[PDB]
Structure formats: structure tokens, C-alpha cells
Design a protein around this ligand. Structure first.
Ligand SMILES: CC(C)Oc1ccc(CC[C@@]2(C3CCCC3)CC(O)=CC(=O)O2)cc1F
Length: 562
């Protein structure tokens, strides 16, 4: 069936859209080639519509059925509970999309009578009615990228499809416990969202070492959300239903599946009918869990079809990496084609065709790769990095323009040991926080799709707990990593190391001069910038820091605030 049908009504914005990085003294000090940085807008929604719209053909075989049976068996070991209206309300981001029924996210969080009553009525309706398609809004996302000259043309806007706030709270009540606990039970060590960046590195390295002649590949599905069929979504529901659930949960899950998850009408911000969806909704609670299960099922079966030897998968939504035993270069290329053919039959055709890789450092998954640097003792150590282009472009935008959610803070947290997060992101943003006297102000950021309020002054202990003390003393980064950063700095027009070091020393001195948590930031985050090093001992606050909850599950598109 067609992933989408369209009426001709436009996908409309509801606020002004800026497409060019503005000229701004603060962002200019970070990167001067502002014309390289753009944001997507509703103007390119038509381009995206064409890309996401196609007929899916799906044929299922014995391998598919076998894997599904195994997954259901694991799912049957899971007991999940309904959330109360209170608990669900508390998971709603403060700035989540308001309801069309006269209340917003703040009212939901405050347990406002108008909010809570409508939620109860939506829930009751889910129980009474298991057929009527539920309305969704479709919007073009405004996301920031750098121009890729070698590729041609800007990325068009991604779309988001989401039901009303009232429905989203009901999804949490029925399914929050399921989507938080089920994936790890079903997929075990293959479930990527259970890992911190360091734990992800550990899993990848150990998996690589477990093979005699390791070979790995990332598999890019062409528009994964759109490839997801009614069958796939019903199969996901059948997996959910294997859980030990309350009767009202079972009914609500069945209802949400029939009325929302399988498909439904698309409405623009002007209230006009834009068309109809028969694929994954990108803005529902089950997007991440559904994609992860479905990607895992199809890939596991395709591994068997391709007769890959000892395939180990790591899955995060639609992001898939496979590590296996090499059968030789020609044999590997042939087996990857068979894998691709199998995935295609399952309705997960390739974007870029998968390529066998024999160096672990060259495998990119979740937009990231393992690399090597040296710790204080000179020992080679593994850590997670990524190309810094998008992080830096977004940092520049977030410098020039105010936004609730700050990718830069998430990037510092997740990539704290990296050359670029330390040299550039920490230096740049602490200089701004110093200038603004806003070090004490908590900021919102995203980790694995969930939103968190984080105090920048807590960064030293957060980094220690997450990455260890070595994050503050890594040096001698790999030539490949240094070269990649070098290319980025040239492309974006970012100042060189000598400039960042100078800026960092000044930032550090000021932080130190202020005492308290500010001084701890100066000492630990910027020790790299000084000749006369300070001794970096374990921070007492880090030992009593429970960073569990951060890496339990993925919630991208799921409207989750922790
Ligand atoms: C990209 C290239 C043209 O320039 C650089 C080369 C190396 C580095 C790393 C410098 C280093 C890090 C420490 C954390 C931030 C800067 C690590 C290192 O090996 C020595 C050092 O003085 O600091 C940055 C650079 F910007």
C-alpha cells in the first residue's frame, strides 16, 4: 500500500521560519562561514513528501516467522503496569504541543481539572471505540545542518506526525512501562539504548574482538518510517500483547494500534486535511520501540537468509550495525547483497548500499564511531566520537538564536572525551555563560530522545560518572580523528587550537576566580589548556550520582520529559 496519500493541502508552519544562520558576533567567533549553515523549513516539505511516499511490497518467510516466535517468547516474560494519570502527566515536557481542547502542557503538568478530565475522556473513548482513526497533525521540522558540497542540494525538512496532547498522555498510561522495559528483554545486548556512550564503545569493541576475522557494516534503510507496513505495526502489537498486562491496558493498546499506530488522517497547522498515513507515525510513544523491534526482527531474519556467520546486531530505532565473521572479501560482498535482498523483501530496502568494513574505527553507527586516544599514563583507550560538523553548526545557531532545547549541552555530555567537545563546545559555551552570568541556570537537552533539565555547573561530576576522570586528561587523538576535525574547521571557518586554548585559559581563570561549582568547572573541564596542570581527583558529588534512567530506553518522537 502507499505509505501516504496527499490531498494537495500544504504542510504549513505556525511560526516564522529562518533558513540562514544570522550574522551575529558571538556565533561568528565560533565559525565565520555562516553561509554554510542552514535550517530546514516548511518550504521544502514537498520534496520530503515525494521522498516518503511509495508503495510497499512485503513478503514474509520462515526466517522471519522463526525470529518473531523467539521474540514473542522473550516478550512473554515481561510484566508491565499501567501508569496513573498523575505519573503520565509528570512525563510531559513543559513546552509540549498544546491540546486543541483548550489546555497546554503546563496545565497537564499542574494536573489542571480541564486537562485531567479530557484525558479521562480520551481514555474512556479508547476503551469504547477501537476503530475510528485518530487525528494527527503533520509539521515540517526546523533542523540545522551544514551544506554538503560533495552531495549537492540541501536536505529537505523532516516531517513529524503526532496526535493531540490528550492522546499522548493516554499513550504513556498504556505503554510507557512497555516501551521502557520490553525492548531490552526481547533484544538483550542488541538493544542499543541501554548503553551510555562508553558502554556502547565497550559492546562494540568486545563484539569486534569476539570474531576471529571481524567484518561489520551499517545498514541504512531508505526512509525507515515509511517502509513500516500495517503488518509490521500489527506484529509489534502482538509482541506488546505477549506481556502480562492489565485488561484496560490490553484494550487501550489494541485501540491505539487500530486507531493511531496503523495509520490515520493528517491535518496541517491550519486545520486542513493534508492526506492519510499507512506507515509509522514519527511522533508517537511507540516510534522508537516499534522501529527498534521491527528493525531487529527484519535484520535478524535477513542474517539467516544471507547465512552470515555469527552475526551480532546493535539496533537503535532504525539505526542498524551488524558485526560478523568474514568469509573473505568477495564472499562478504556477496553475502551483503543477499542480506540487502532479504531486507528489501521484508520492506526495508537500502538507502546507501551496505559496505563491508574491516576496521572498527571506520564503522559509523548512531552517527558515531569508536576511536582511540591516550590517557594520562599514555595508555591507548577507546571512546565514542562523531564528525563535529552538525554539532558545531547547531552550536552556532543556538548561539545566535534563543531556543528551549540546547543540542550543545547534550553534545558536551555525550561527547565529553572528544577533542572537539572539549576544545570548542566547552570553551565557547562557558564563555557565554560567564558573560551572561547564567552558569546557575538549568537548561533543557535531549538524551536518547528524552528531555532533561541539566545544570551546566554539574558537568564535571556528570562527565566523571559517565566517562570517568580520563575524560579530563585524554590527549594524542588519532590521526584520522584529528584530520576529520581539521577538515571541519576549514569548512566551517572555525578558529584553530591556539585560539581555543587562549580562550579556554581565560574562561578557566575566571571560573577559578569565582569559587564554588564554577571553580570546579574551571579546574576539571579546562585542565587541558594549561601547562601547570592541576591534580584531578574524584569529585565527591560524582560518587552519589545516579545516571541510570538516562540509558534505559529510546524515546525519540515520544514526548518524554525526565
Ligand atoms: C585539527 C588540527 C588542525 O588541530 C588540532 C590538533 C590537535 C588537537 C588536540 C589538542 C589537545 C586537546 C585536549 C582536549 C582539547 C584539545 C590534545 C592533545 O594531544 C594536546 C593538547 O594540547 O590538547 C586539536 C586541534 F585543533
Amino acid at each position: 500500500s502507499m505509505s501516504y496519500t496527499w490531498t494537495g493541502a500544504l504542510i504549513t508552519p505556525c511560526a516564522a521560519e529562518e533558513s540562514k544562520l544570522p550574522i551575529n558576533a558571538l556565533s561568528n567567533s565560533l565559525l565565520r562561514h555562516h553561509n554554510m549553515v542552514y535550517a530546514t523549513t516548511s518550504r521544502s516539505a514537498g520534496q520530503r513528501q515525494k521522498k516518503v511516499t511509495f508503495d510497499r511490497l512485503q513478503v514474509l518467510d520462515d526466517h522471519y516467522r522463526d525470529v518473531l516466535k523467539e521474540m514473542k517468547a522473550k516478550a512473554s516474560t515481561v510484566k508491565a503496569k499501567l501508569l496513573s494519570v498523575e505519573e503520565a502527566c509528570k512525563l510531559t515536557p513543559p513546552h509540549s504541543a498544546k491540546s486543541k481542547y483548550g489546555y497546554g502542557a503546563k496545565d497537564v503538568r499542574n494536573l489542571s481539572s480541564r486537562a485531567v478530565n479530557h484525558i479521562h475522556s480520551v481514555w474512556k473513548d479508547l476503551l469504547e471505540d477501537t476503530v475510528t482513526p485518530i487525528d494527527t497533525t503533520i509539521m515540517a521540522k526546523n533542523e540545522v545542518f551544514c551544506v554538503q558540497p560533495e552531495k549537492g542540494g540541501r536536505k529537505p525538512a523532516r516531517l513529524i506526525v503526532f496526535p493531540d496532547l490528550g492522546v499522548r498522555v493516554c499513550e504513556k498510561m498504556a505503554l510507557y512501562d512497555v516501551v521502557s522495559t520490553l525492548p531490552q528483554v526481547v533484544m538483550g545486548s542488541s538493544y542499543g539504548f541501554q548503553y551510555s556512550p562508553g558502554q556502547r564503545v565497550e559492546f562494540l569493541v568486545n563484539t569486534w574482538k569476539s570474531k576471529k576475522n571481524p567484518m561489520g557494516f551499517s545498514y541504512d534503510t531508505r526512509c525507515f518510517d515509511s517502509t513500516v507496513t500495517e503488518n509490521d505495526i500489527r506484529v509489534e502489537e502482538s509482541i506488546y500483547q505477549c506481556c502480562d498486562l492489565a485488561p484496560e491496558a490490553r484494550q487501550a493498546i489494541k485501540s491505539l494500534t487500530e486507531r493511531l499506530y496503523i495509520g490515520g488522517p493528517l491535518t496541517n497547522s491550519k486545520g486542513q486535511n493534508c492526506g492519510y498515513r499507512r506507515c509509522r507515525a514519527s511522533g508517537v510513544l511507540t516510534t522508537s520501540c516499534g522501529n527498534t523491534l521491527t528493525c531487529y526482527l527484519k535484520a535478524s531474519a535477513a542474517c539467516r537468509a544471507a547465512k552470515l556467520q555469527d552475526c551480532t546486531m546493535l539496533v537503535n530505532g532504525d539505526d542498524l550495525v551488524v558485526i560478523c565473521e568474514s568469509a573473505g572479501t568477495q564472499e562478504d560482498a556477496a553475502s551483503l547483497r543477499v542480506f540487502t535482498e532479504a531486507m528489501t523483501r521484508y520492506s526495508a530496502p537500502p538507502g546507501d548500499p551496505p559496505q563491508p568494513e574491516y576496521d572498527l574505527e571506520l564503522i559509523t553507527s548512531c552517527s558515531s564511531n569508536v576511536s582511540v586516544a591516550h590517557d594520562a599514563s599514555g595508555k591507548r583507550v577507546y571512546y565514542l566520537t562523531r564528525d563535529p560538523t552538525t554539532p558545531l553548526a547547531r552550536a552556532a545557531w543556538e548561539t545566535a538564536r534563543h531556543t528551549p532545547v540546547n543540542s550543545w549541552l547534550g553534545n558536551i555530555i555525550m561527547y565529553a572525551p572528544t577533542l572537539w567537545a572539549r576544545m570548542i563546545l566547552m570553551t565557547h559555551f562557558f564563555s557565554i555563560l560567564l558573560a551572561q552570568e547564567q552558569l546557575e541556570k538549568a537548561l533543557d537537552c535531549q538524551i536518547y530522545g528524552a528531555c532533561y533539565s541539566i545544570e551546566p555547573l554539574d558537568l564535571p561530576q556528570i562527565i566523571e560518572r559517565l566517562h570517568g576522570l580520563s575524560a579530563f586528561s585524554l590527549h594524542s587523538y588519532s590521526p584520522g580523528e584529528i584530520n576529520r576535525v581539521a577538515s571541519c574547521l576549514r569548512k566551517l571557518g572555525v578558529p584553530p587550537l591556539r585560539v581555543w586554548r587562549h580562550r579556554a585559559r581565560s574562561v578557566r581563570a575566571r571560573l577559578l576566580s569565582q569559587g564554588g561549582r564554577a571553580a570546579t568547572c574551571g579546574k576539571y573541564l579546562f585542565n587541558w589548556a594549561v601547562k601547570t596542570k592541576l591534580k584531578l581527583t574524584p569529585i565527591p558529588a560524582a560518587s552519589q550520582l545516579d545516571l541510570s534512567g538516562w540509558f534505559v530506553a529510546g524515546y525519540s518522537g515520544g514526548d518524554i520529559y525526565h
